C-alpha cells in the first residue's frame, strides 16, 4: 500500500471498532461512582460457583460476540478463506475481549464494571479461580498505565485477531499481507500522533495466550465437577468454544459469520 491507503486503513479500522465495542467507553467512565455497597459484594460471594460461572460465560459469550462483528466489518477479513476466519477468531476472540476489558477497569480503586456497579475483584470469589481473576486485574491494571486512546485499542486489537503465525491456516501468505497492512497502519498512527513509545511496553503475546489457557483450564476443572450445569445452561458459543467435549464452534461462528 502507498501512503494514502494505509491512513485509510486507519480510519476503516477506527470506524469498524467504533461500531462494534459493545459498551461505549463514556458510559463505563461515567459510573466509575457507582460502587457495590459492602453488602452487595456479600451477595455475590454467596452465590454458588456455578451461578457466578453462568453469569461469567453469558457476558463473555455476549463479548466475544462483538467481536465477532468486529471482525466481520474488519477490513480484509471476510476476503480470507472460511476456514481461515474461524481458525483466526477461535485462537484470538477472547484474547480481543481480554484487551477490550480493560477499557472497564478503574485503575485508581481496582475495581472493574459488572452488572450496574463498580467493584474490585473480591466480588468473584464464589468462582474459586482466584489466581486467573488476580492475573486478568494485573493485566488490566498494566494496560490501564498505558492510556489507550480508543483508535489505539481498535488498530491494537485488529493486530491481535489477525495473527498470521496461528496454526492451522491454509492461506498463510494471505493473512501475513493483511496483518503486515495493519501493522503499517497501527504504526503510522502512533507515529503520527508520537505515541511510539508505547510499542515497547505492550504486553508480549505469551501473556494473552496465558490468560487464555488459564480460562480454559479452569472452565475444564468447574465442568467436571457441574457437567450438567454446562451443558443445560452455558450459551452455544461458549460450550463449542471452550468447554471439553466441545464441537468446537466451527458451525455456530460460520453462521455468524454468513448472516
Ligand atoms: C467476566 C469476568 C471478568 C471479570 O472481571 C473483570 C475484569 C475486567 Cl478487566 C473487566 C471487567 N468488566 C468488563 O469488562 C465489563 C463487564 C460488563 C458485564 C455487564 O454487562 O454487566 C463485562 C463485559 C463483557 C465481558 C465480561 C465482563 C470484569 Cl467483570 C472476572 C470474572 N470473569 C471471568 O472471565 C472469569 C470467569 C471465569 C473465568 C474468568
Redesign the pocket.
Known sequence: ASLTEIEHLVQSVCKSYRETC??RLEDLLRQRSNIFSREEVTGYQRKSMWEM?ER?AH??T??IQYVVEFAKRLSGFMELCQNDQIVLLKAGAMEV?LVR??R??NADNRT?????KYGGMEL?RA?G?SE??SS??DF?HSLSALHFSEDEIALYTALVLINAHRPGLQEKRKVEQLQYNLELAFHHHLCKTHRQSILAKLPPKGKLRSLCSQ?VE??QIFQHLHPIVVQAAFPPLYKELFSTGGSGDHKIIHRLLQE
Request: charged residues 10%.
Open positions: 459493545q459498551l460461572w461469567c457476558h463473555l455476549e463479548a475481549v476489558m480493560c472497564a477497569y472493574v464494571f459488572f452488572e450496574g468473584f468462582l479461580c486467573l481473576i486478568i486485574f488490566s480460562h479452569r472452565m
